[PDB]
Structures are given as C-alpha cells and as structure tokens.
Design a protein around this ligand. Structure first.
Ligand SMILES: Cc1c(Cl)cccc1Nc1ncccc1C(=O)O
Ligand SMILES: Cc1c(Cl)cccc1Nc1ncccc1C(=O)O
Lengths: 115, 114, 114, 115
C-alpha cells in the first residue's frame, strides 16, 4: 500500500481513533475524483487504504474530518477539516505517510516519503 | 479588519515574506467563491485583507501558495498548497488570525480568535 | 530588548496568559545561572525580560512552567516543563523571539531572529 | 520496553537518523542521573532503549542532540538540544512514545502514552 496516515491527539496523548477521511485525485479540469474513504482505527491508521493501481502519478487531496472528532471529544474545534494536498510520484514503489497531530485550534502535518 | 495572518519560516527563523494567498467563502451548494487575494510582507502579514462587510458567518478557506514559497527559497516542498478551512462566527467584532509555521515537508497552523 | 516570547494556546485559540518562565545562561563549567524571571501577559508576551547588557553571546535556556499553566486550565499535562535551549549571537543588535504553541500533551517551539 | 522515541525530519520528509540522545532520571536533590544513551536508527527510533526495571516512577529527561543533526545536514540550527521532561507512572506496563518533528529553527514534540 503506497498511502498511509498516522493521526495523533495532542490533548489526550493517544492516537486519534475514529477520524473519518476521504482521498481524492485531481482531474484535468481542476476537479476532484473521490477514490477512497475510511475511518482511522485506534492506532490512528487505516490499513490498506488504497492499492498501487489506484495511485498513479498525479495530485492527491486527503481531507480529514477533524471537526467531528473534536465535537465527539467535547471540545470546540476551529477547523472544518484538515486538508493535505500533494503531487505523488509513485514509481519504484515510493510510499507516502501523512502524519497529523491534532489540537482543537491547531494541527501539524508532515509527510514521510520513502525512496 | 477581521482576518489576519502570521506566517513564519521554520528553516531560517524569520517571518515568511512574499507568500501568496487566496481567500474564499463556501457557497450554500458547497462550492467556493474567491473574495480576496494578497501576498505577505516581510513581517509575514497582510494588512487589510478583507473588511467586516465582506465577512459574514460561514465557512472560509485560505489557500497559501507554500509550494511557490519553498521553490523560491531553493528547497523542494512536499505540499502543493496549504489550505486552512474554518467556520467563522464574526458576531461581536470577533477577529481571526491564522498563524502558520512552514517547513518544506511540514506545516503547523493555529488560530488566535479575539 | 533582545529576548521576547510569544506563547499561544492551541486548545482555546488565544495567547497563553500567566505562563511563568525563568531565563538562565550556561556557565563555562556547564552549570546554569538564573538571570531573569517573568510571567506572560494576556497577549502571551513579556516586555523587557532582559537588557542587552545582560545578553552576551552564549548558551541560554528559557524554562516555561507549562505544567502549572495546564493544571490551571483544567487539563492534565504531559510535560513537567518546556525548556528552550539555544546559542545566542547578539552581535549587531540581533533580537530573539521564542514562539511557543501549547497543547496538553504537545508543544511546538520556533524562533524569529532579526 | 516502556520508553520509545520517533524522530522525523521536516526538511527532507524522512525519519531523522543518527540523532544522539541521553535519558536521565531526576534525583532528590534536583540533579540528574544518566540511565541510557543511544543514536537513532534510519527509522528515527532506538529499540529497547531501557528496561522496565530501569524505569521506576519518577521524573525523566530525554535530551536529543538536534544541533549536531542539523550541522551534519548542512543547515544552521537554532536550538542546542531538544529536551523532553515528564513524570513517568509506569505501573501496569504503561508505555511512553516521545514523538519529535525537527526543523532547523523549530521542533514539535508530543507524547503517546498507553493505558
Ligand atoms: C507564536 C507563533 C507560532 Cl508558534 C507559529 C506561527 C506564528 C506565531 N506567532 C504569532 N501568531 C499569532 C499572532 C502573533 C504572532 C507573533 O509572533 O507576533
Ligand atoms: C512522530 C509523529 C509526529 Cl511528530 C506527529 C504525528 C505522528 C508521528 N508519528 C509517526 N509518523 C509517521 C510514521 C510513524 C509514526 C509513529 O509514531 O509510529
């Protein structure tokens, strides 16, 4: 699997479980095609989110529904979502991990890309 | 002015100057209408980005052109753009500052709401 | 003034007021001498923390009492303290701002150096 | 093993390999006893850093030598070190992961604590 996530909760000090997300692929006219969805497990991950065949070179957007996560925790969130948008170059089985650290009014996102 | 930004560069330890951005408001059908553009000054800020009259409650997106920023700094970036999407509640002259801390492969974003 | 701070609270979206801190400079033998203390105001800042005369080059530590801050906010914290340790190069009236973004189990810290 | 680290490099998008660190335990008179040292592997980790017997309840400091890491990468760093100081409550095999995200002038650190 070429696309992984890892979400952490900076209030409780745990992975962020049960965060819904969507993966989309940019189209030529500037639109977006939804290619996968899921909800993180208790480790803040979604295993086998997409296949290599689903992940050709191009621009991808991963939208994480952080607002619902905070509402369920009892916190008042600032952001509607956290968006991560990047150009993927999957040749040679290059892998992408999108790391995300959540607080009610803030997030940090980084990427780990293999070679 | 109800919407401010403060952008810092985590590599060189300065504000991030000359970062282009676009502000959009979400429509009832789920699309986006662009309402303003700007470019940060050497303090990482943009003065008078929009007016209160342009800022009813609703969902807004600020799209920061971080890819161009990092290319111009000479460092290969990861993100195509940095988007900050938030629901505004301006009643009571509430003001919003979007703070943004940039690295080539990472950013942190937070808000200060008065 | 050559040393400033800016502390934000990532839970409530405000500056972090009433955060206590202590500034120390490292001695030649590797110990620490405390040179100043302060407490942030409601903007998350401390004005006139030290003077240029108190700020030769060297290694400095700022110790922020984040555990007390979070206990007072009513949220269990992880860290006992947040320490920022850096080598200062004041020649040329160079000024340092320590930016700090706090959550109960996490912090981000960066610097703006003029 | 009750104490793990995970260090990432926010410039290159990789784990931060070959970062030296030290683990110390606070003493009653306010001093520090060094209990372990190591250097991260290419995954940004140190496996089996300490044992459970080495990790009684108390205050611990993990000092990461980030300055040398950036000098080797060719960057000019701000911080001398990154310090993480916390009170450990290891009963019930509670585990601590210290996550650290590095840039030349900035770091983010969070903890993942099990239960
Ligand atoms: C403290 C900070 C961080 Cl941690 C990251 C990005 C900008 C900032 N700074 C600010 N954010 C909001 C308003 C003012 C500032 C400032 O630095 O003056
Ligand atoms: C270190 C870290 C930070 Cl600083 C923020 C969010 C997730 C992580 N953790 C990871 N990121 C990527 C891959 C693995 C991990 C992990 O913690 O196992």
């Amino acid at each position: 699997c070429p696309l992984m996530v890892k979400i952490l909760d900076a209030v409780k000090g745990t992975p962020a479980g049960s965060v819904a997300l969507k993966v989309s692929q940019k189209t030529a006219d500037g639109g977006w095609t939804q290619i996968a969805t899921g909800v993180t497990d208790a480790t803040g991950e979604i295993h086998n989110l997409i296949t290599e065949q689903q992940f050709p070179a191009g621009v991808y957007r991963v939208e994480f529904d952080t607002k619902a996560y905070w509402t369920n925790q009892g916190s008042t969130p600032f952001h509607e979502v956290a968006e991560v948008v990047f150009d993927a170059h999957p040749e040679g089985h290059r892998h992408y991990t999108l790391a995300l650290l959540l607080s009610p009014f803030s997030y940090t996102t980084t990427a780990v890309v293999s070679s």
